[model samples]
Target: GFKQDIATIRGDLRTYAQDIFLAFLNKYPDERRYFKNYVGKSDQELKSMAKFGDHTEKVFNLMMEVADRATDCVPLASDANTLVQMKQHSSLTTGNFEKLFVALVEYMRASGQSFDSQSWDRFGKNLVSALSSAGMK
Candidate 1:
């Protein structure tokens, strides 16, 4: 499932990260406030920010973990804790995360990157569960 998708995209995560982030932010510009490090930066300006790169890497690495370890589709204790803090500090909601995941799937489809439907289902469900469990709902 996502193991295959990860293999196909790993080589280009840097590029994909920017594109996916852009796609999501473009669709929900109001959400940009949550990304304080990159707030108010245009898409081109964001490319030059070290914090953005680091954030992007961290984001993708977590996805790689889930892709490689299907069992981790459920949030780890650490992951749930992180989500709780983000929800508290940034007001990130389940809907925000869900929309971001939708952006990823839409990006893949638009770019012609193949992905298994089951992978998306598993990822989405676990994420929704994780976010809601953290009181993000």
Candidate 2:
């Protein structure tokens, strides 16, 4: 069986994207109209967009792109196999998870935009719950 730590991977990835989106919005509030139009849109519509196959895909790709561009960011693993390993682990270390989380948050804040821990936590939790329920298996 694949010891994929998917729970942690998904949690980390989703939080990373949320951080990036929040930073982007804070930096360019004028662009709020663009995100607002798509933020809560249906997956079918979001998938139709050229850059992403769905809302999850869009966020995942965006997170990867942002992390790639950030000088201080380093992912624990980037391949599908590693992510699968994470999925198999039931309890993930908060230490490793928070390291990536803080890296993304700091990267965004350094780029200009205050990080709101409260909202970040709320959104991150919701995302993890949603993804967990919709488990890949």
- Prediction 2 TM-score vs. true: 0.28
- Per residue, candidate 1 scores C-alpha lDDT tens digits across 73-137 of 55465565565675344666677777888887777667765677456756776867776776765
The TM-score measured for candidate 1 stands at: 0.79
lDDT of 2: 0.41
The clash tally of candidate 2 reads: 12
Over 4 Å off in model 1, which ranges?
A: 72-82, 85-90
67-103: candidate 2 lDDT, tens digit per residue = 3432322232333224435543334433333334444
The ten-residue window of minimal lDDT in model 2 covers: 1-10
The positional error of residue 15 in candidate 2, measured at the CA in angstroms, is: 0.6
